[PDB]
From Swiss-Prot:
Quaternary structure and interacting proteins, as annotated: Component of some HBO1 complex composed of KAT7/HBO1, MEAF6, ING4 and BRD1/BRPF2. Component of the MOZ/MORF complex composed at least of ING5, KAT6A, KAT6B, MEAF6 and one of BRPF1, BRD1/BRPF2 and BRPF3. Interacts (via PHD-type zinc finger domain) with unmodified histone H3. Interacts (via PWWP domain) with dimethylated and trimethylated 'Lys-79' on histone H3.
Tissue and organ distribution: Highly expressed in testis.
Subcellular location: Nucleus; Chromosome
Function: Scaffold subunit of various histone acetyltransferase (HAT) complexes, such as the MOZ/MORF and HBO1 complexes, that acts as a regulator of hematopoiesis. Plays a key role in HBO1 complex by directing KAT7/HBO1 specificity towards histone H3 'Lys-14' acetylation (H3K14ac), thereby promoting erythroid differentiation.
Covalent cross-link site, Glycyl lysine isopeptide (Lys-Gly) (interchain with G-Cter in SUMO2): 41
Protein name in UniProt: Bromodomain-containing protein 1
Domain Bromo positions: 9-113
Gene name of the encoded protein: BRD1
């Protein structure tokens, strides 16, 4: 149907905007702490701690399959990155501190993405 196509074009356009958001958020992680999944070879107990792991490569795979229906879904995954890190790692670690900085800096990017998603529909 034409309606299915129009809905598909909206998803595609949302996907394009989310890719730019994701690029901007990932620039706020220049050390690449959150680039890849936590290695279960190197942190074998990780899944006893963290029930829903997340990282930017895994978000990128979901994104390119047009797997985010709305900005809320994307934000949930970004929040998992930060929140998992702040539970597993102590306050006095380079990892926890990188999560705080990413959170604080990403807030700005996400604040305008919300306005753009609402605005463009």
């Amino acid at each position: 149907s034409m309606e299915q196509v129009a809905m598909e074009l909206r998803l595609t356009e949302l996907t394009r905007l989310l890719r730019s958001v994701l690029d901007q958020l990932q620039d706020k992680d220049p050390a690449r702490i959150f680039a890849q999944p936590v290695s279960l070879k190197e942190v074998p107990d990780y899944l006893d701690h963290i029930k829903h792991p997340m990282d930017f490569a895994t978000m990128r795979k979901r994104l390119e399959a047009q797997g985010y229906k709305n900005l809320h879904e994307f934000e949930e995954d970004f929040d998992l990155i930060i929140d998992n890190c702040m539970k597993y790692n102590a306050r006095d670690t380079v990892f926890y501190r990188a999560a705080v900085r990413l959170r604080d800096q990403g807030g700005v990017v996400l604040r305008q993405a919300r306005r753009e998603v609402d605005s463009i529909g």
